[PDB]
Amino acid sequence: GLECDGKVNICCKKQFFVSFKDIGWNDWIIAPSGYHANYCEGECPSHIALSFHSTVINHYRMRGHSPFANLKSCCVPTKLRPMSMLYYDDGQNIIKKDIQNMIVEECGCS
Amino acid sequence: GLECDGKVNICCKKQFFVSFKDIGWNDWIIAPSGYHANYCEGECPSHIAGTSGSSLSFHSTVINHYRMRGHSPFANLKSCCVPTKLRPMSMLYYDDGQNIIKKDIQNMIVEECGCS
Amino acid sequence: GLECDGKVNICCKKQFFVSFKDIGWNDWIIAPSGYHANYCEGECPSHIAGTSGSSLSFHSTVINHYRMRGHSPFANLKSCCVPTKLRPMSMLYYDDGQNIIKKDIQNMIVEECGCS
Amino acid sequence: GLECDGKVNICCKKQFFVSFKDIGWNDWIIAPSGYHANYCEGECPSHIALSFHSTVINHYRMRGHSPFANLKSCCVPTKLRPMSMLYYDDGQNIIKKDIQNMIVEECGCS
Ligand SMILES: CCC[C@]1(C)C(=O)Nc2ccccc2C(=O)N1CC
Ligand SMILES: CCC[C@]1(C)C(=O)Nc2ccccc2C(=O)N1CC
Numbered sequence: 001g002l003e004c005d006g007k008v009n010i011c012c013k014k015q016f017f018v019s020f021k022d023i024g025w026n027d028w029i030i031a032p033s034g035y036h037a038n039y040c041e042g043e044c045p046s047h048i049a050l051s052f053h054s055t056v057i058n059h060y061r062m063r064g065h066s067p068f069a070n071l072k073s074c075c076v077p078t079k080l081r082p083m084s085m086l087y088y089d090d091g092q093n094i095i096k097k098d099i100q101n102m103i104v105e106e107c108g109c110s
Numbered sequence: 111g112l113e114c115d116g117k118v119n120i121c122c123k124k125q126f127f128v129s130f131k132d133i134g135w136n137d138w139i140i141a142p143s144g145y146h147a148n149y150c151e152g153e154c155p156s157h158i159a160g161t162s163g164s165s166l167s168f169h170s171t172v173i174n175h176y177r178m179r180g181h182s183p184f185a186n187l188k189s190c191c192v193p194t195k196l197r198p199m200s201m202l203y204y205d206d207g208q209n210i211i212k213k214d215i216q217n218m219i220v221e222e223c224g225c226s
Numbered sequence: 227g228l229e230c231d232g233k234v235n236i237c238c239k240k241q242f243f244v245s246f247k248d249i250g251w252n253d254w255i256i257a258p259s260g261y262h263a264n265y266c267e268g269e270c271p272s273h274i275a276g277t278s279g280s281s282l283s284f285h286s287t288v289i290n291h292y293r294m295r296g297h298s299p300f301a302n303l304k305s306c307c308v309p310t311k312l313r314p315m316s317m318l319y320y321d322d323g324q325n326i327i328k329k330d331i332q333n334m335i336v337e338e339c340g341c342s
Numbered sequence: 343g344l345e346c347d348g349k350v351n352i353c354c355k356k357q358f359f360v361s362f363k364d365i366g367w368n369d370w371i372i373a374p375s376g377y378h379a380n381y382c383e384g385e386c387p388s389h390i391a392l393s394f395h396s397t398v399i400n401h402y403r404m405r406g407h408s409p410f411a412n413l414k415s416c417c418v419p420t421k422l423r424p425m426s427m428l429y430y431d432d433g434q435n436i437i438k439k440d441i442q443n444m445i446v447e448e449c450g451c452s
Contacts (some may be wrong), residue, residue: 001322001324002254002320002322002324003324003325008253008254008320009253010253010254013324018172023172023175037169037172037173039173039183039184039187040226041183041187043253045250045253046250047249047250047251047253048253050196050216050217052215052216052217052218053147053193053196053217053218053219053220056128056133056147057126057149059133059135060128060132060133067126067149067151071151072190074188074190074192074226076190076192076226077169077226080167080169099168100167100168101167101168101169101170102167102168102169103169104169106324110190110192110193110226133389134387134388134389135389137350137351137352137385137387137389137390138344138350138352204344204350206343206344208343208344208345208355208448209345242399242409244398244402248402249398249401249402251401263395263398265399265409267409267413283422283442283443283444284441284442284443284444285379285419285422285443285444285445285446286443288360288365288379289379289381291365299381299383300381303381303383304416306414306416306418306452308416308418308452309395309452312392312395331394332392332394333392333394333395334394334395335395336395342382342416342418342419342452
């Protein structure tokens with residue numbers, strides 16, 4: 001997908017870093033101190049809309065056949081990566097775990 | 111995730127039968143000729159923004175932090191009912207390399223919907 | 227090949243100004259924003275079937291053998307005014323690998339037309 | 343591109359061999375004795391139409407904007423290969439030459 005700069009208008013990935021200290025989560029997250037979560041922003045006009053399932057919806061959208069005639073496309077993550085994390089749990093044990101769905105790696109039009 | 115039913119107004123999964131005839135792709139796809147793909151639709155109000163049915167991922171949890179507290183752009187950003195899990199499907203078709211392939215094509219069937 | 231002019235009815239090359247705005251592709255193409263692509267049109271009667279203006283390739287010469295003598299399928303096969311030579315063009319655009327590329331894109335400008 | 347079998351209906355490459363003996367050209371073509379010239383046959387409907395120049399024409403065709411609204415697409419060679427050939431010339435000298443545009447290697451919709 002596209003990486004947002006300040007020029008591209010269409011759906012892209014915006015770099016976004018989050019400190020656990022700044023948001024007050026470091027009391028239970030020991031490590032890492034922060035990471036690039038990222039997010040998706042941007043337009044999804046007709047001339048673009050894994051896209052495989054979305055593409056077939058888009059092909060149906062190309063005729064006024066009416067579930068998809070109205071269905072607006074959205075810029076959303078199309079790929080997420082996990083990340084290793086150390087944290088306190090309910091019994092306050094320190095746990096090490098590969099946490100799924102932590103980083104947005106790519107964005108796309110639904 | 112949620113499946114649509116009577117009176118469900120929020121993001122849910124419903125049937126979508128794809129016939130390749132209908133979009134002309136039967137000129138190169140041999141099998142299957144049609145399949146249940148499914149689709150996601152419905153409202154994503156803020157009390158379910160980022161969720162995947164009854165689950166909330168870590169990433170959605172940090173976005174909610176900012177959204178909840180009014181920080182931009184996340185305050186303006188629309189939440190859309192979209193697939194969160196897809197399954198592949200075995201397919202037999204003609205490709206551009208001048209031959210007929212059988213292969214598992216990724217992300218062809220919607221398994222779960224949720225709010226971006 | 228032939229260029230169109232007054233009273234030319236057969237296959238010839240004419241102007242076609244492409245503006246990327248018009249087809250939405252300016253959302254990822256930075257430069258050029260528009261260009262003279264050209265196009266081929268007009269009649270391909272049998273006395274010029276297979277030719278490229280004033281030239282006739284070897285391949286077209288064997289097809290004409292069969293066409294001329296009525297052999298099928300070549301007897302039924304339509305002859306179309308189509309490009310026979312194209313030129314590339316330098317382009318600056320955003321690709322899917324999350325970056326901005328400069329590169330010579332092939333077969334963007336029609337140089338010569340002729341009959342299939 | 344696609345290779346015609348008897349099943350695909352859309353624009354494909356049809357294998358076609360031509361003997362110079364059968365067609366009476368062996369008096370001036372010494373070698374080779376024959377070759378696969380091939381040809382293109384098949385439909386080109388909307389859902390398909392280097393395609394780069396053709397694609398942009400197709401993108402214009404997707405609105406009734408009117409040069410291309412009517413312009414029917416045709417199955418034609420998109421790639422030709424040369425082949426080495428021995429032949430008698432006007433002075434009846436034997437010439438060896440890489441003859442361009444002898445084999446149709448791929449077909450496509452204009
Ligand atoms: C959306 C299915 C995508 C797939 C797998 C493919 O590899 N390329 C394309 C690309 C565009 C349109 C259809 C196909 C297509 O028919 N096939 C074969 C099933
Ligand atoms: C028809 C120009 C083809 C090219 C070179 C490309 O590599 N892929 C696509 C594919 C589909 C549509 C446009 C482009 C596209 O915009 N680009 C960048 C100029």
